[PDB]
């Protein structure tokens, strides 16, 4: 399956 | 002759099922024939297959046991297929193998024990398969292993501590499994390790102090593991670390001042822990730092001024803490700042004048702070500005006039501020401006005369900012779907051509001084849902056209003075609160049925 990489992309 | 090489390859061709494009190339005419085949690489001398690349040819089936006859194989790539079932042990018999890529397949059940039989394996990539149960402990016997990737399967249990015995290993990606337990400290003993990706598991305890020993570690990601506890201070010793992702965890305590020594450090993300403390003043010294993200922690401090002088800093995310003091006013001066979101803090002071210095800054989020003073006129000269949300502040003075020049400017929330005087008229020039909210401000002036000419403006809200004069005349009204003007002094009639707003959904004209008839053109709006005209001077009769409108949900006309019958129609089941305080209204809803005669007030 896909796993996330890189920085946390929470946004406003 | 009997060629094992040919038996092996042809077994592969019959056993793996794919489109013609796959094995059509492999044919025996009526002299070492296989070396010309797709992805088959012979040894110049022996004519034995030393490399087989089978990747990304949609192919299913099972590997045949005959694959063991390619005994000179150094390189096997099965990556990116539909291959399924238990991992075939047949592979473990190719003992000269060096790199083996199993990735982006669906292999299931437990991983089989033979793997240690490949004495020389340098690279093993299993990323994105269906494996379950324990990580194989045999891997710990591979002396030359450099890259190990088991990420993206369903493996459970603890990381085998014996892995920390792989002293040529530079790359370990375990992330995206279900692995549990405490992280074995012996992992710190991996001497050549540079990349470590363990995140998106469910672990126990903390980062062990012993990881500080990974001298050459560059990338360290363990996120959305359930790691907790105080953040190990010995980590400052990792001088080659350039990527540190600890976000979406439970780490508590403060940021060890020792971290000011992570001198190679480029990206740092602690988002969404409970990290209460303040930013080490030592962070001025991270000269290569680019990403700094502390979002959604309990940090309370003053941002060290030196961060304004960080040369390479591009994104800065501080929001949802409680910081105080002022932003470093030197901030944008590196000319590299790209996004910045400091919202929902206690920041005070003026907005730095330099933020866009290099015209690279497209996202500026300041809202829900105590920022005071005027908006730097430099923001209007920032050509890359895309999204700007500064509301819920003390911002002052008059809104500078250069924003409509900006070719990318889409979203602007200036609301809940102290702005005064006149609403820049170039807002209606802004080429892409989608959303403009000026609500609750103190300019006493009228709307820009061209405001409804805005080409792309969908949502415009000026409510409860002190507006005077009439409503401009709604000429283009191309994209508007939400218009909030309530709570002002606007006078005059409601423009007859409101009909030109075809995409209009919600319209709040409440709490003004607006007189004259209610324009019937409202009922010709195809999509109109919410109409609030209440608390005005509107007179005359409610156009009968409105009962023919099957689209309309809230129509609030109360606290006007209207007369005549209430439209019968879709209005029949409407909330009767909507017609109150109009003493001349007539009909079934208000419980004063209508005078029926020759002369009426309608038509
Ligand atoms: C809608 O309202 C606006 C203004 O808003 C309201 O202004 C008055 C009516 C208050 O009751 C408040 O509720 C609001 O703030 C009206 O437009 C405004 O009209 C003004 C005159 O009615 C006009 O002022 C005039 O001032 C110049 C000089 O005028 C001489 O008289 C003044 C006092 O009137 C005197 O002190 C002065 O020294 C002068 O000798 C005059 O020459 C100007 O050109 C102007 O006519 C405002 O400028 C004007 N403001 C705006 C924003 O348009 C409007 O008439 C109202 N419409 C309706 C239908 O009622
Ligand atoms: C244009 O801007 C207007 C003003 O900037 C918008 O109208 C106003 O919107 C705000 C919130 O969006 C609203 O105030 C509310 O804020 C307080 C905080 O609510 C949250 O926080 C509390 C504790 O802080 C927490 O329990 C919750 O999570 C809650 O969601 C509330 O305490 C307060 O009572 C209120 O609900 C204003 O009332 C609102 N109206 C006005 C006249 O200011 C407007 O929506 C916007 N328009 C568009 C189209 O975007
Ligand atoms: C097994 O085969 C895989 C596919 O044949 C191969 O993966 C692909 O490898 C290339 C590298 O040669 C990557 O292509 C591009 O990578 C970067 C950007 O990500 C570019 O800068 C490069 O110039 C290059 O164009 C692919 O991204 C990569 N993945 C996929 C899905 O195609 C594996 O490398 C092979 N395994 C081994 C061990 O060699
Ligand atoms: C701004 O920050 C505060 C606290 O960091 C947030 O307020 C809390 O939000 C949580 C989750 O939504 C609620 O369970 C609490 O009840 C809130 N506390 C109070 C005192 O109301 C607030 O939501 C943040 N704002 C944004 C936009 O993220
Ligand atoms: C964020 O920190 C500040 C402290 O700088 C808290 O601000 C309030 O400060 C006043 C004095 O200026 C005192 O009444 C209290 O110390 C604080 N208020 C309260 C209600 O305790 C602020 O409350 C903090 N934000 C939080 C805790 O959400
Ligand atoms: C605009 O904002 C500034 C800052 O809040 C105000 O003027 C300054 O601040 C206080 C009042 O808040 C004054 O006592 C200072 O003397 C002013 N100078 C400096 C350097 O801070 C001003 O009152 C605000 N309102 C306007 C200009 O209408
Ligand atoms: C139009 O705007 C008014 C703003 O006053 C809305 O009515 C108020 O709604 C708030 C909820 O945010 C209530 O707390 C107030 O009590 C309401 N005011 C009154 C006088 O009752 C109204 O709902 C808006 N209409 C639409 C369709 O959005
Ligand atoms: C964090 O983990 C949970 C469950 O493991 C998951 O639902 C959530 O999406 C994760 N967060 C991110 C950003 O992927
Ligand atoms: C960093 O490494 C060495 C340990 O051998 C020493 O400089 C110092 O004790 C370490 N820092 C710590 C443990 O905080
Ligand atoms: C970052 O600092 C390191 C020190 O290890 C140096 O080698 C490097 O040149 C700096 N950054 C860049 C982009 O060169
Ligand atoms: C405007 O935004 C586009 C992407 O939408 C970007 O490619 C371009 O560089 C931006 N232009 C300026 C002047 O910032």
Numbering used by the authors:
A (entry chain D): 1 to 12
B (entry chain B): 31 to 60, 65 to 637
Question: Paper's wording?
Answer:
TDR belongs to the LRR-RK class XI subfamily, and consists of the extracellular LRR domain and the cytoplasmic kinase domain10. TDR recognizes TDIF by its extracellular LRR domain, and activates the intracellular GSK3 pathway to suppress the transcription factor BES1, which promotes cellular differentiation into tracheary elements.
Finally, we obtained the crystals of the TDR–TDIF complex, which diffracted X-rays up to 3.0 Å resolution. The extracellular domain of TDR forms a twisted right-handed superhelix composed of 22 LRRs and N-terminal (residues 34–81) and C-terminal (residues 609–637) capping domains. In the crystal structure, we observed the electron densities for the 11 glycan chains attached to the Asn side chains in the LRR domains, although their biological functions are unknown. The electron density of TDIF is clearly defined on the concave surface of LRR4–LRR15 of TDR. TDIF adopts an extended conformation, with a kink around Gly6–Hyp7 at the middle of the peptide. At the C-terminal part, the Asn12 side-chain carbonyl group of TDIF hydrogen bonds with the side chains of Arg421 and Arg423 of TDR.
